[PDB]
Design a protein around this nucleic acid. Structure first.
Ligand SMILES: [Mg+2]
Ligand SMILES: [Mg+2]
Ligand SMILES: [Mg+2]
Ligand SMILES: [Mg+2]
Ligand SMILES: [Mg+2]
Ligand SMILES: [Mg+2]
Ligand SMILES: [Mg+2]
Ligand SMILES: [Mg+2]
Ligand SMILES: [Mg+2]
Ligand SMILES: [Mg+2]
Ligand SMILES: [Mg+2]
Ligand SMILES: [Mg+2]
Ligand SMILES: [Mg+2]
Ligand SMILES: [Mg+2]
Ligand SMILES: [Mg+2]
Ligand SMILES: [Mg+2]
Ligand SMILES: [Mg+2]
Ligand SMILES: [Mg+2]
Ligand SMILES: [Mg+2]
Ligand SMILES: [Mg+2]
Ligand SMILES: [Mg+2]
Ligand SMILES: [Mg+2]
Ligand SMILES: [Mg+2]
Ligand SMILES: [Mg+2]
Ligand SMILES: [Mg+2]
Ligand SMILES: [Mg+2]
Ligand SMILES: [Mg+2]
Ligand SMILES: [Mg+2]
Ligand SMILES: [Mg+2]
Ligand SMILES: [Mg+2]
Ligand SMILES: [Mg+2]
Ligand SMILES: [Mg+2]
Ligand SMILES: [Mg+2]
Ligand SMILES: [Mg+2]
Ligand SMILES: [Mg+2]
Ligand SMILES: [Mg+2]
Ligand SMILES: [Mg+2]
Ligand SMILES: [Mg+2]
Ligand SMILES: [Mg+2]
Ligand SMILES: [Mg+2]
Ligand SMILES: [Mg+2]
Ligand SMILES: [Mg+2]
Ligand SMILES: [Mg+2]
Ligand SMILES: [Mg+2]
Ligand SMILES: [Mg+2]
Ligand SMILES: [Mg+2]
Ligand SMILES: [Mg+2]
Ligand SMILES: [Mg+2]
Ligand SMILES: [Mg+2]
Ligand SMILES: [Mg+2]
Ligand SMILES: [Mg+2]
Ligand SMILES: [Mg+2]
Ligand SMILES: [Mg+2]
Ligand SMILES: [Mg+2]
Ligand SMILES: [Mg+2]
Ligand SMILES: [Mg+2]
Ligand SMILES: [Mg+2]
Ligand SMILES: [Mg+2]
Ligand SMILES: [Mg+2]
Ligand SMILES: [Mg+2]
Ligand SMILES: [Mg+2]
Ligand SMILES: [Mg+2]
Ligand SMILES: [Mg+2]
Ligand SMILES: [Mg+2]
Ligand SMILES: [Mg+2]
Ligand SMILES: [Mg+2]
Ligand SMILES: [Mg+2]
Ligand SMILES: [Mg+2]
Ligand SMILES: [Mg+2]
Ligand SMILES: [Mg+2]
Ligand SMILES: [Mg+2]
Ligand SMILES: [Mg+2]
Ligand SMILES: [Mg+2]
Ligand SMILES: [Mg+2]
Ligand SMILES: [Mg+2]
Ligand SMILES: [Mg+2]
Ligand SMILES: [Mg+2]
Ligand SMILES: [Mg+2]
Ligand SMILES: [Mg+2]
Ligand SMILES: [Mg+2]
Ligand SMILES: [Mg+2]
Ligand SMILES: [Mg+2]
Ligand SMILES: [Mg+2]
Ligand SMILES: [Mg+2]
Ligand SMILES: [Mg+2]
Ligand SMILES: [Mg+2]
Ligand SMILES: [Mg+2]
Ligand SMILES: [Mg+2]
Ligand SMILES: [Mg+2]
Ligand SMILES: [Mg+2]
Ligand SMILES: [Mg+2]
Ligand SMILES: [Mg+2]
Ligand SMILES: [Mg+2]
Ligand SMILES: [Mg+2]
Ligand SMILES: [Mg+2]
Ligand SMILES: [Mg+2]
Ligand SMILES: [Mg+2]
Ligand SMILES: [Mg+2]
Ligand SMILES: [Mg+2]
Ligand SMILES: [Mg+2]
Ligand SMILES: [Mg+2]
Ligand SMILES: [Mg+2]
Ligand SMILES: [Mg+2]
Ligand SMILES: [Mg+2]
Ligand SMILES: [Zn+2]
Lengths: 84, 62, 208, 99, 100
RNA sequence: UGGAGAGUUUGAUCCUGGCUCAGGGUGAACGCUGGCGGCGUGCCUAAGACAUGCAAGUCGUGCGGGCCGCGGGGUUUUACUCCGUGGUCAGCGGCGGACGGGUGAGUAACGCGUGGGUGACCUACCCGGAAGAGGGGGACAACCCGGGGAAACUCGGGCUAAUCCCCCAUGUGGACCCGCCCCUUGGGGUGUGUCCAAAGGGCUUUGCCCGCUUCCGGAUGGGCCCGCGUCCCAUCAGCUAGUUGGUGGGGUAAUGGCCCACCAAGGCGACGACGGGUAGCCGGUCUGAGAGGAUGGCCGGCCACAGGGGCACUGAGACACGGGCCCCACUCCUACGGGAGGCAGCAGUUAGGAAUCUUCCGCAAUGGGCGCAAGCCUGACGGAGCGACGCCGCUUGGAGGAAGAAGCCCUUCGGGGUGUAAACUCCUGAACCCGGGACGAAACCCCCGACGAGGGGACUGACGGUACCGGGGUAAUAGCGCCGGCCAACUCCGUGCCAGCAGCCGCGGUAAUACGGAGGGCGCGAGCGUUACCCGGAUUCACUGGGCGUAAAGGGCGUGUAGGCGGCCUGGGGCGUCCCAUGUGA
């Protein structure tokens, strides 16, 4: 099924994952369906994360699927707080 | 093929390597021989342009 | 790596003082007030009308030999400068001065550029409070260049800073002599510093 | 010197021998109706044609026939029989045909 | 949208089928001179009504047959066997270029 | 926001014109030499052949057995079945193995690029909506027994489990025939007839969860078709029998001459058919002022192939690298009595070659599959390893230091040069020594709240004690090319058309700035050269941007086919052309 995961960028010993929506049968650094933010597991930038919640949950309404590690960020990004 | 420099050690069944580049004075020969390769030893007692002539750096004083 | 060896000979190959030495290339001569002629056996011999090429070659070596920087790193700049818009020629020296080892020579921390390199290299120089042992480092507006604590002494630093009293700094610099700190205020236009070098001839030499 | 997933093949045979046998039936059985509906016997034929319809649509519970397949079969089946019986025959049991 | 073209008919010697000859003017990518082209299609005509000279139209359609993926749209002006002339000459003259 | 020219035809001139150089580029190679780090990149050749290892498995929340345990049911001799938990190894069933990895052979074609079509279609797992999950039978492994073999193993006889198989029921719904309605290429709907479903397993069970079943949507991934674009030779000019159209069938998810019958005789080509040759295409890449030219290697998209061919099975999807059958060739085991294998997966071996690496570490991270979840596999991947192959950063030091030693060069023997260079005196002091030491990790999971939200807690690092931090701390690799002109850099000697240099023009005949060494100089620097190839200069295929009286070039002359081109006014159309708007051009 279509998933939401991390895609290594940047360089060696210097990750800069791109968070994106694409088919699970694609290569992790392949052609994705839609880019929706990034993340720096090194914390070496004020913008070490960013999400387009309006566009993110949409794929969830159509039935997406985040990784166990992509969840973490997604949840710890303020996209899961159901609210009322 | 041309053999550059002064004096060589090439007999009949000698191995060798081709370079490319004609002579001119010598019609019908458009290839030079790389020195200090296979059976082509560099020019002995060469002190100037050693890059070609496949001569290695000699010892100065002792 | 960088150049090493006879330098007063260059001082006089171009036929101009360039103060690559500390006191000497600045004392009575770069070995030239003695012998103001070119090195080599053919020194005291008349010269042949230098060709338009040899002129641009000479006027180039001059400039590069001044900052004592390899032909590598060197042309890289001109291209980066040339890449830009405006004048490039002026922009060029802009990128030349921005070097760390350069700022140090100007800010009197050292007398010679080659002495300034040893400083930056060994780690006796600072930048906004950082250990920057890289002479290639390019500096911008407001950058603070001081000495590190492990070094804020050394009988060689006090001498250099001391000599800097009774002397001024560029219209694009400012030194806190008594504190060991300096600042890069702005990029020095062609005016801000005059030199035996006609850039325009260096621009031509690169459009082979 | 291999993998145990060689099963898949070792299985895939059964599924083969399974829906192969299931299919040889449909063919010989789809014939009955054809032959009959060709020769008057509307009654006895229009019970083989309901059956045929079975085995066909029944088959769609596995990886034998699927998609518009069973549909294309009948489409040509319970349309071919109606044309045959149309010549003489005269209908007898719509048991399968919304005439 | 389904591609739509305007061409003339030169053949109907196929049971249910006609051959339409199309043209298109466009500048040369390197010399910019406005030039013409040509492409014969196999037009589907079930009710074989159209004949030669029929300056008609055609529409992109589902595969009728191999080589035949175009149905006929409408007439644009029948009775033009004049265009079918210069086309007939061309193929006519192709027996004068033979390397024999 | 972008453009340089020079050398060589003559005694000299102008022109034409070719050859040559300076420039940038490369998956490179070769010579001489070679210290550090970082980030890239590394079989272009034999898509030749490959030992060994590894590269896809997973679920006991589908079943029965295996022994092993294991706390331990209960009694007519080595424990017992009873239990549960397991631990499981194989067997049954489920999911994946069609993704991910490699290669460029083939293909000049709807393969690709770009824009569209499908009222001619499929799509498992995922999401949403509606309805269901009623009963009744059966098989094969496992296992016991039997045969053959050296093996591969194989067959044979008889039991048994289920989410395995079968039948009936139920039909929310779906499927097809006909009529009808709307739309209108088989789209939606209607009526009537007939056909069609299911699966249980685990529980902090009596309520949830993990699944099952049919349908209508969502999403994603596709298939098929179409317009335009896609190299060289016309010294390949004619090609075609399923060939072109038809009818009707077979076939598929479905169109199609895809396949098969029969009907007709068509279909294609100088707008280059057919044929031979070369080639995987694009994003991009290199060069260029530009337009162009060249290129498709790493990374990304598509295609194709998986020893050479053919084929079908299973399946949602393959005609399937690590799945199967057959033929071929090749190779290997063998007690020869017979069987085995497919590196263009990761490394490595071998051959070929001018030439291209470790038979390394780790699943810590990211991604993938299986699972309720721990957890499991993962030569994808993260890293480390080798190669100045590339770009980048870094070092072999810094100040002072003589009217300026020695040595070696020239010399008119007065002197000039190497040269602040060294020495020498101070200064710092990369490497190394000691301690410290990571960011990369947070979730999944656990408790609270209902496993929702939220909060809290905990786990895990391959790289490796590595980057980096402190301090201690030593002056510590320099090589290569050129110095006739183009083109930057000159003297002595040796040599005497010899030995030799050479991109071009040309150097050497006893005074050679052109050979060979030396001194000195110019140019670069862990590089410097060489060879080869692409663009540039070449405006030298000239679209931008050239020529044909004598420099290469007007057909020997007409007639004329196709083709290109076309006079003054006015109207319709608005193809070309032009503006705006919008989509696409990741
Ligand atoms: Mg895919
Ligand atoms: Mg979470
Ligand atoms: Mg500018
Ligand atoms: Mg230039
Ligand atoms: Mg079912
Ligand atoms: Mg099937
Ligand atoms: Mg010239
Ligand atoms: Mg002449
Ligand atoms: Mg002459
Ligand atoms: Mg010319
Ligand atoms: Mg070159
Ligand atoms: Mg290549
Ligand atoms: Mg090989
Ligand atoms: Mg071979
Ligand atoms: Mg377990
Ligand atoms: Mg595969
Ligand atoms: Mg792949
Ligand atoms: Mg490889
Ligand atoms: Mg690779
Ligand atoms: Mg061909
Ligand atoms: Mg062709
Ligand atoms: Mg036995
Ligand atoms: Mg039996
Ligand atoms: Mg039973
Ligand atoms: Mg039933
Ligand atoms: Mg309908
Ligand atoms: Mg049932
Ligand atoms: Mg159980
Ligand atoms: Mg495909
Ligand atoms: Mg048909
Ligand atoms: Mg199929
Ligand atoms: Mg057909
Ligand atoms: Mg048909
Ligand atoms: Mg036929
Ligand atoms: Mg002709
Ligand atoms: Mg054409
Ligand atoms: Mg042609
Ligand atoms: Mg061919
Ligand atoms: Mg090829
Ligand atoms: Mg291109
Ligand atoms: Mg580019
Ligand atoms: Mg440009
Ligand atoms: Mg271009
Ligand atoms: Mg190409
Ligand atoms: Mg490759
Ligand atoms: Mg690739
Ligand atoms: Mg092979
Ligand atoms: Mg698929
Ligand atoms: Mg496979
Ligand atoms: Mg296969
Ligand atoms: Mg395939
Ligand atoms: Mg394999
Ligand atoms: Mg093997
Ligand atoms: Mg390998
Ligand atoms: Mg290897
Ligand atoms: Mg060899
Ligand atoms: Mg590697
Ligand atoms: Mg892992
Ligand atoms: Mg994982
Ligand atoms: Mg799980
Ligand atoms: Mg394994
Ligand atoms: Mg491993
Ligand atoms: Mg790797
Ligand atoms: Mg290195
Ligand atoms: Mg080398
Ligand atoms: Mg002196
Ligand atoms: Mg001296
Ligand atoms: Mg010194
Ligand atoms: Mg000390
Ligand atoms: Mg410690
Ligand atoms: Mg874990
Ligand atoms: Mg928490
Ligand atoms: Mg926490
Ligand atoms: Mg340490
Ligand atoms: Mg230290
Ligand atoms: Mg020293
Ligand atoms: Mg040179
Ligand atoms: Mg030069
Ligand atoms: Mg000169
Ligand atoms: Mg001579
Ligand atoms: Mg002579
Ligand atoms: Mg020489
Ligand atoms: Mg002499
Ligand atoms: Mg002479
Ligand atoms: Mg020379
Ligand atoms: Mg010489
Ligand atoms: Mg010298
Ligand atoms: Mg010299
Ligand atoms: Mg090189
Ligand atoms: Mg240029
Ligand atoms: Mg022109
Ligand atoms: Mg001309
Ligand atoms: Mg004329
Ligand atoms: Mg003449
Ligand atoms: Mg003439
Ligand atoms: Mg004439
Ligand atoms: Mg004429
Ligand atoms: Mg004639
Ligand atoms: Mg004529
Ligand atoms: Mg005419
Ligand atoms: Mg006209
Ligand atoms: Mg007109
Ligand atoms: Mg008009
Ligand atoms: Mg637009
Ligand atoms: Zn000086």
């Amino acid at each position: 099924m279509v998933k939401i995961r991390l895609a290594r960028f940047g360089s060696k010993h210097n990750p800069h994952y791109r968070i994106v929506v694409t088919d699970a049968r694609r290569k992790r650094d392949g052609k994705y369906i839609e880019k929706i933010g990034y993340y720096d597991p090194r914390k070496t930038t004020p913008d070490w994360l960013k999400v387009d919640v309006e566009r993110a949950r949409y794929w969830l309404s159509v039935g997406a699927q985040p990784t166990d590690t992509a969840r973490r960020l997604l949840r710890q990004a303020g996209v899961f707080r159901q609210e009322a | 093929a041309y053999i550059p420099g002064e004096g060589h050690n090439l007999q009949e069944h000698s191995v060798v390597l081709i370079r490319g580049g004609r002579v001119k004075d010598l019609p019908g020969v458009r290839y030079h021989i790389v020195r200090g390769v296979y059976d082509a030893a560099g020019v002995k007692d060469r002190k100037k342009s050693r890059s070609k002539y496949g001569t290695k750096k000699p010892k100065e004083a002792a | 790596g960088r150049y090493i060896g006879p330098v007063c000979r260059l001082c006089r190959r171009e036929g101009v003082k360039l103060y690559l030495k500390g006191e000497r290339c600045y004392s009575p001569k770069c070995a030239m007030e003695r012998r103001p002629y070119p090195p080599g056996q053919h020194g005291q011999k008349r010269a042949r009308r230098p060709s338009d090429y040899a002129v641009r070659l000479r006027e180039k070596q001059k400039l590069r030999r001044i900052y004592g920087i390899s032909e590598r790193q060197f042309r890289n700049l001109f291209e980066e400068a040339s890449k830009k818009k405006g004048v490039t020629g002026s922009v060029f020296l802009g990128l030349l001065e921005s070097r760390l080892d350069n700022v140090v020579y100007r800010l009197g921390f050292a007398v010679s550029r080659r002495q300034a390199r040893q400083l930056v290299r060994h780690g006796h120089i600072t930048v906004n409070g950082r250990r920057v042992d890289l002479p290639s480092y390019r500096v911008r507006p407001g950058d603070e260049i001081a000495v590190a604590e492990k070094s804020r002494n050394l009988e060689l630093i006090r001498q250099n800073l001391e000599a800097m009293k009774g002397r001024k700094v560029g219209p694009w610099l400012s030194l806190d002599v008594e504190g060991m700190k300096g600042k890069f205020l702005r990029l020095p236009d062609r005016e801000d510093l005059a030199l035996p070098v006609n850039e325009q001839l260096v621009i031509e030499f690169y459009s082979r | 010197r291999n993998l145990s997933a060689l099963k898949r093949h070792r299985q895939s045979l059964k599924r083969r021998l399974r829906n192969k046998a299931k299919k040889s039936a449909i063919k010989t059985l789809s014939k009955k109706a054809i032959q009959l509906a060709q020769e008057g016997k509307a009654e006895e034929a229009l019970k083989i044609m309901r059956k045929a319809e079975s085995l066909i649509d029944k088959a769609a519970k596995g990886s034998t026939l699927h998609k518009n397949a069973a549909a294309r079969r009948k489409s040509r089946l319970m349309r071919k029989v109606r044309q045959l019986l149309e010549a003489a025959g005269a209908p007898l049991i719509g048991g399968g045909l919304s005439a | 949208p389904k591609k739509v073209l305007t061409g003339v008919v030169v053949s109907d010697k196929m049971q249910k089928t006609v051959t339409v000859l199309v043209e298109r003017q466009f500048p040369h990518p390197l010399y910019g001179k406005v030039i013409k082209r040509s492409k014969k299609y196999l037009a589907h005509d079930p009710e074989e009504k159209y004949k030669l000279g029929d300056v008609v139209e055609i529409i992109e359609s589902r595969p009728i047959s191999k080589r035949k993926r175009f149905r006929v749209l409408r007439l644009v002006e029948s009775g033009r066997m004049d265009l079918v002339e210069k086309y007939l000459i061309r193929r006519q003259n192709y027996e004068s270029l033979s390397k024999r």
